[PDB]
Amino acid sequence: MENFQKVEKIGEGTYGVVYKARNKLTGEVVALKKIVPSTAIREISLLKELNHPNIVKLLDVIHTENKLYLVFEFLHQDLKKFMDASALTGIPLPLIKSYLFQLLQGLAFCHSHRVLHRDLKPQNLLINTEGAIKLADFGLARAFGVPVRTYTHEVVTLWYRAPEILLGCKYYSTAVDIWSLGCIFAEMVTRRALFPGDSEIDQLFRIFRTLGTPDEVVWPGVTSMPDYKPSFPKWARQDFSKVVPPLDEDGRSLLSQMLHYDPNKRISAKAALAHPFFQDVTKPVPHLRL
Ligand SMILES: Cc1nc(C)c(-c2ccnc(N/C=N\O)n2)s1
């Protein structure tokens, strides 16, 4: 731990602040996240062996006097920022399409080894001047979870949370990740969050008012879920043409499938890569201001 010299604060996570750190030894620049039991360790240690070009590498795990340290490779920017930096113009489609392609490539990899992220948001997606984007804090939800607030004495984000999770399902699959990504995808195209809910019920209803209130017809077993309430308002499904304009039909189709209520009907990572939308996929370069 005394092998790193803090430089600045890359930000604050839901369970620990992130710092950019100089590696006294190698002298390499790394992302250091401070955070305990043994089960977690065995788990987060297992993540070290998991590596993919689009999965932000967990270089080394460091546990000292009940003070956990995650050492990650460093990337200079996250999508949340890059987006704020492109709100006026907007990310070019070719970059959106590639960013989604690579993201699923990664998702496909993790899910393949049955590793869910549970909490994908732009802020956990990192990019480099070379045109690549990677997933960060992946598989960390399994190790621990989330309090009532956060370490930073605040509150997380529900905006990208799937409905099964919002409805009480305690045994959710990889499908939840596809939902989050699909939301992100939509944000990239419109430059505004899809379901910016400010509470679980707001989150749910906001989702209801766009895709209609679910039921056994489109989501078999939906009424038997823990937090499902028969008294839910019955909204009608809005036209997707009004949701992600001006995205083309290939996009709307692909998105529609990433947002199917029924998790098992929801499109998978491996499958999304073969969807017509990636017929003309390339690898543009971003224009980050460092
Ligand atoms: C929240 C974050 N979680 C991780 C793992 C982050 C991260 C990872 C790599 N590089 C960076 N740096 C971003 N800007 O300087 N941030 S930011």
Which ranges in the chain are annotated with CATH 3.30.200.20? 1-76
Q: Give the separation between CA 173 and CA 275, rounded to whole angstroms.
A: 21
CATH fold group of domain 77-289:
Transferase(Phosphotransferase); domain 1 (1.10.510)
**198 part of the active site:** no
Locate 175 and state its tokens. Answer: 């499908």
Report which ligand 1 atom has the smallest distance to the Cα of 13: 1
**Ligand 1, atom 4: closest residue by C-alpha:** 136
Does the beta carbon of 98 lie inside 6 Å of ligand 1?
A: no
List the strands of the sheet with 58-64, edge to edge: 5-13, 16-22, 29-34, 67-73, 58-64
Helix spans in the chain (H): 39-46, 79-84, 93-112, 163-166, 175-190, 200-211, 249-258, 269-272
Does the beta carbon of 138 lie inside 6 Å of ligand 1?
A: no
Report which ligand 1 atom has the smallest distance to the Cα of 75: 10
Distances (CA, A) of 94 to 79, 163, 285: 15, 30, 9
Nearest to residue 75, comparing CAs of 17, 109, 124? 124
Method for structure elucidation: X-ray
Residue 107 carries which side chain, given as an amino acid letter?
A: L
Q: Give the separation between CA 208 and CA 82, rounded to whole angstroms.
A: 29
Residue 131 carries which side chain, given as an amino acid letter?
A: G
> Exposed, middle or buried by CB within 10 Å (0-12, 13-18, 19+), for 76?
middle
Report which ligand 1 atom has the smallest distance to the Cα of 136: 5
- 1-76: CATH number: 3.30.200.20
Q: Give the separation between CA 124 and CA 8, rounded to whole angstroms.
A: 18
Binding residues for Mg(2+): 124, 137
Exposure b/e, 140-174, CB count within 10 A at least 16 = b: bbbbbeeeeeeeeeeebbbbbbbbbbbbebeebbb
**Ligand 1, atom 1: closest residue by C-alpha:** 13
Which ranges in the chain are annotated with CATH 1.10.510.10? 77-289
In a mutational test of the pocket of ligand 1, which residue from 15, 29, 60, 75 has the highest number of ligand atoms less than 8 Å from its CB? Answer: 75
List the strands of the sheet with 125-127, edge to edge: 77-78, 125-127, 133-135
Tell me if 254 sits within 8 A of 275, measured CB to CB.
yes
Tell me if 186 sits within 8 A of 243, measured CB to CB.
yes
Distance between alpha carbon 262 and the CA centroid of its chain, in Å? 19
Helix spans in 85-174 (H): 93-112, 163-166
Number of neighbouring beta carbons within 10 Å of residue 212: 15
Q: Give the separation between CA 174 and CA 147, rounded to whole angstroms.
A: 22
